[PDB]
Each structure stands twice: as structure tokens, then as C-alpha cells.
Point group: C2
Chain length 226, copies 2
Amino acid sequence: ALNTLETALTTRDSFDPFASTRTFNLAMTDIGEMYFMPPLMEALAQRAPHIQISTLRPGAGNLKEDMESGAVDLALGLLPELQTGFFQRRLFRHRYVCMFRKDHPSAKSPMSLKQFSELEHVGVVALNTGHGEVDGLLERAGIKRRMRLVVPHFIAIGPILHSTDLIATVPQRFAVRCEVPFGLTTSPHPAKLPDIAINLFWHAKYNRDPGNMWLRQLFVELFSEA
Amino acid sequence: TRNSFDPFASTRTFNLAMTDIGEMYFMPPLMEALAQRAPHIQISTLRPNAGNLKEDMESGAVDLALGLLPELQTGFFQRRLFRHRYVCMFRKDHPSAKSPMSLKQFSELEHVGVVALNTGHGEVDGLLERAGIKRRMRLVVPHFIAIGPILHSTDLIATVPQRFAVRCEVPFGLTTSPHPAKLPDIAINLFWHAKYNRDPGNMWLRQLFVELFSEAHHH
């Protein structure tokens, strides 16, 4: 409360996007990095050519603490622990989808729940993320899956689906970075999987820092569906 | 179960430690081979900096590990699979980047760096610094997942293991040059605990790894 009256009465560091050499530190998941970073860096080349960006996974250590000190400027995803002293803004919802190689010998779009349960799958654990909940969701619905392979993260999924008959359950924004590169198609998901809201977060201490505001607005401009 | 092994009917789950580059390189052709040769086994993987690897290999929770992994000494057998070289990578229609790239151009273009902490690839940054090669580090990420898409959409360049380049080159429309710096090659080995040296199932998986990936016999 009383650090909002001190941190508003302070003079603000100027921000000129053509001249800034500031480094902005951003927390995001592996899917975030793959979704956000290509179009963000494309935009920054034309708009703020001398700033630097570095990212990190929230799943390291004390994101909250590091956001309060200014060590991390912004965070993206579903980050339930960030509540008191944090603003937030919803960018979009992840819709889950089934993915497999273009010329899979039996897989169809749209895919019935029956065929989903007949086929063999790769799964991704994605510990402590929204996507980490997909496994429990399907199990609790009594939807049987032959789990031929399980991996902890998303990196190998495109190449694995390319060169096997496995199928995967995947956020649709992941699918879009993979369909063409890896010769893959998608189907609407046959199960009842709920969406995952992806939010942009920042600490209150930087609510009026012009650099921080400038970067947030660019995220909203490029990524907001809302 | 234990004292002999039949690939074609086994239902066993094998648990494999691998980095993100390893997972991307090893898993597609491994799974392709397993579909024909052992269609009912299951595979699960994890990263070596997860859990406690030395301890989990002793207990049999982790069957095999792949990588440089210099801490697996007493108690552990190892076998060389290949060395890979660092290359430099960029989109095929980059306005100016060429192969083979000069050090001058390397130090003039803009880079995406990969931290790859607690990994052999984590030494890159320091190695370049100490030899006085300058880089404008425009983006730094902790791991390799977004590199292909990032290079496709920008004029950035990256220093990347060559086995990464072979998975990304064609899917993302990228080119690779030999790397102008003198970065050391990184050895990639297959590791197993002594207690499982003579376990039939483990032995069979190991032989498959050697068959698909070992490069001893062509130089």
C-alpha cells in the first residue's frame, strides 16, 4: 500500500525506443518462448533495435521475489502464485488439439473419441504448468491412452510425430509453429479439455515505468485476442 | 522376466536421461525403430539436471543416460557414440550471412544465445568471451526449443550443435556454416550403471543405441 505512494512520487526513467539499450528480462514457459519470441523479435528489429531481451522459465527460483526487485520485468502464462502486489491482463486462451503426421495411415480429422483411444500416443509431462494437468484430466475422465512415449517438455514433438505414427495432445498455438515445418495436421480434440488462459503480469512498482509500459503494450498489440 | 529378454513381446518401461538436443536427435529414429522391433515396450525420458541422476541409476529408476556427463565415474560404464561440432545457423535467404562465415561477419551480425546451464553447451559463452570474440547478444534464451522459429523470422544467427542443425535445417528453411571460432567438439556417450551391465533388456537397448547412433566405423 505505502510503497505505491513512494514509487509514484519518484521521477520516472525516460524511455526512447529508438535509443534504449536496456535489457528486459521475461519469464515464460517453453511453449511461450516458442510462441511469443519469433514475432516479438521480428517487431523489435523495426522498433527498438538496440534493446536486449533475455528469458527464463518460471519453474526456476522465486519469480515473485525477482519481480519485486526489478530483476524480472514481465511474466507470461498462468501463474496462480502471483496475486498480491501484481497486476495482470489476459492475452488469450489456449485451446487443445490433436496432432499427427499428414499421411498417418489411419488418423482422421475430426477424430472420434474411440480412435483417440485405439491409437498410440506421445505425452508431455510439463510439470507445474497448465499443460501438466492434461494427463490427470484424461485419466479422471476414464479415457484410456496407450502411452508409447512420455517426454518432459515440448521440443522433440514435431520431429517425433513426423517420423512415427504416434499422436499428441497439444495447445493449438504449438501446432501452428509445427504444422508446416514438420508436415503435420491437426484435428479438433475429441475429449472435453478445458482452455488455459495466458496472462501478462507485472509488479505494481513498475506499473508506471515507461519502458515497462512500452513493452507491455507491444505484447498486447501483437498477442491479445481479448 | 529378468534372466532372458524377448523384444517383440516385452511390456517393460525404459527410462532414459537426455538433454533437450539429445531428445530431439535420439528420439525420432529410436521410436521409428521400436515400432517394428519392440512394439509393446514403453519409453519415458527425463533431463539429467532433474532429480538425482547418480542415485536414480543405482536404484534402476533410470536405465540409461546420454551426454557428456562428467560426474558419472565410479560405478558407471561408458561408451562413445559421437563427437559433434558447433556450427553457425541462419535463415536461408538472410540478406548478408554467408557459409563459410568469417569471424569478422560473425562478430558484426546479431545473435541469439542459448544459456544451456549445467550442460556441455553451457561453456560456449565463456569460451568465446575469453578468446575476445565479441557478440551483440540481442536475445538470450535458456534452452533450444524456440531457435528454429526465431531464426526463420529474424536476421539473427546462432551457435548450435550440428545434430541440432540436422533436425531444424529443412523444417525451418535454414542454412548452416562451419563455425569460425575454435570451439571444442563435445563428446556424447552412452552411460549405464554397473549393476545393470549384464541385464538382458538394458543390453538390448544399448545395442540398439549403438546400431542407430554410433559412428565408430566411418570417419
